[PDB]
Design an enzyme around this catalytic site. Sequence first.
Site, short mmCIF file in Angstrom:
data_model
loop_
_atom_site.label_atom_id
_atom_site.label_comp_id
_atom_site.label_asym_id
_atom_site.label_seq_id
_atom_site.Cartn_x
_atom_site.Cartn_y
_atom_site.Cartn_z
N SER A 220 -120.27 13.00 -45.18
CA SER A 220 -118.93 13.11 -45.38
C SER A 220 -117.75 12.13 -45.26
O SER A 220 -118.85 10.91 -46.11
CB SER A 220 -117.54 14.23 -44.63
OG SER A 220 -116.91 13.79 -45.71
N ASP A 243 -123.32 15.14 -47.55
CA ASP A 243 -122.57 14.92 -48.29
C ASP A 243 -121.19 14.11 -48.28
O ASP A 243 -120.21 14.46 -48.17
CB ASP A 243 -122.01 16.78 -47.67
CG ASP A 243 -121.02 17.56 -48.49
OD1 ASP A 243 -121.80 17.09 -49.98
OD2 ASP A 243 -120.85 18.51 -48.45
N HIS A 298 -119.53 22.28 -46.95
CA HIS A 298 -119.20 21.00 -46.33
C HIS A 298 -119.48 20.89 -44.70
O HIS A 298 -120.57 19.61 -44.35
CB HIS A 298 -118.03 20.49 -46.35
CG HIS A 298 -117.64 19.02 -46.18
ND1 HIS A 298 -118.50 18.21 -46.26
CD2 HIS A 298 -116.21 18.53 -45.75
CE1 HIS A 298 -117.95 16.56 -46.51
NE2 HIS A 298 -117.32 16.77 -46.07
P1 LIG Z 1 -115.24 14.49 -44.05
O1 LIG Z 1 -115.28 13.25 -43.15
O2 LIG Z 1 -115.80 15.62 -43.57
C1 LIG Z 1 -115.35 16.54 -42.55
C2 LIG Z 1 -113.66 17.04 -43.03
C3 LIG Z 1 -116.03 16.51 -41.42
O3 LIG Z 1 -114.21 14.26 -45.17
C4 LIG Z 1 -113.50 15.14 -45.96
C5 LIG Z 1 -112.73 15.98 -44.95
C6 LIG Z 1 -112.48 15.17 -47.29
#
Ligand SMILES: *P(=O)(OC(C)C)OC(C)C
Length: 372
Positions: A220, A243, A298
């Site tokens: 992410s 993801d 996610h």
């Molecule tokens: P990512 O860095 O996911 C985290 C929720 C683990 O970014 C998202 C929050 C847009």
Amino acid sequence: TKIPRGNGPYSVGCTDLMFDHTNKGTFLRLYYPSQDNDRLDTLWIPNKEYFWGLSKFLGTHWLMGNILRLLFGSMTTPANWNSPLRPGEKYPLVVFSHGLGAFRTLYSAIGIDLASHGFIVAAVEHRDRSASATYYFKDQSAAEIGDKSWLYLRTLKQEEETHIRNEQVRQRAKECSQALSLILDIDHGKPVKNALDLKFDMEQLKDSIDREKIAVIGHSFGGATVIQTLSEDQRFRCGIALDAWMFPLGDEVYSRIPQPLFFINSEYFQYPANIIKMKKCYSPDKERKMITIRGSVHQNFADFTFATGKIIGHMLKLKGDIDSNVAIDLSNKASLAFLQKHLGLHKDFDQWDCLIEGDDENLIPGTNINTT
Ligand SMILES: *P(=O)(OC(C)C)OC(C)C
């Protein structure tokens, strides 16, 4: 607890390494094949300040922080804490980057699984203020006392988002590169004093790394960090973006990634404006693969997907319609196959080669977001 044990043949140890002690030093949790398998006793979220951090991230209060701590403060994760490193072999090495609002301990199902297949995993804790919380020490005496200085997630104004996310992905890449240097340095005799006083002797890591077999992986914000790190650091021989959240990256990066890159996406998170950045990495002269996990959200990539029950998880979006174990085995197995191919490993991971191509009832080749 319900964080799954790894499926590979090796038993799995876990320890923490911080060096140097400062806010500019490296902080990582290590997962590694251990010599022995005596108890699966590693504490999952090892400090109370992470719960305060995590609550600050969920946009709540002191009370939610205390609730999380009660629910999870004692949960373990299936790795032998401070167990001896299994000798006689050089392991391929993974650097792992956490997402926004996470920290180094929250992807143990990935780390522990990879380690059971013969990898050392260095899951980094970023000090870019993207972690819910993290810590460091103001001086060597504070590190001896265990007198931690805490750093908490920075919340941003919309007008800050573009510049700050970019500065953070740059620092993050630099942290991945620097954590790599640390391990490579210990691999080659560099004497090192862990700022944390732990039973694991970091000397065990001397001559333990297969230095040609280096990958970066991340979820992410950590997906973006894979791409950035690859563009800057050729010691990393391939990337796996779990993801990815593409927004932090500048336009410059896309033409600058020679290494093989694997996008493992959740069905339920992706959107066209994000997928379109992923498609910009594709070039006949480069290797890019993409699969999508059917029924996944996610959070399927991180450990909180294993922390509650079906109903609660589904309602909190920690879980999707797929089983969390089914999802994480698909991601891990695809990953192992990708690693074996692009690191030149001589294991049996190529049995899941068809998973790189999306060839499963629970995978989509490519992306459901059909934007071209
Ligand atoms: P990512 O860095 O996911 C985290 C929720 C683990 O970014 C998202 C929050 C847009």
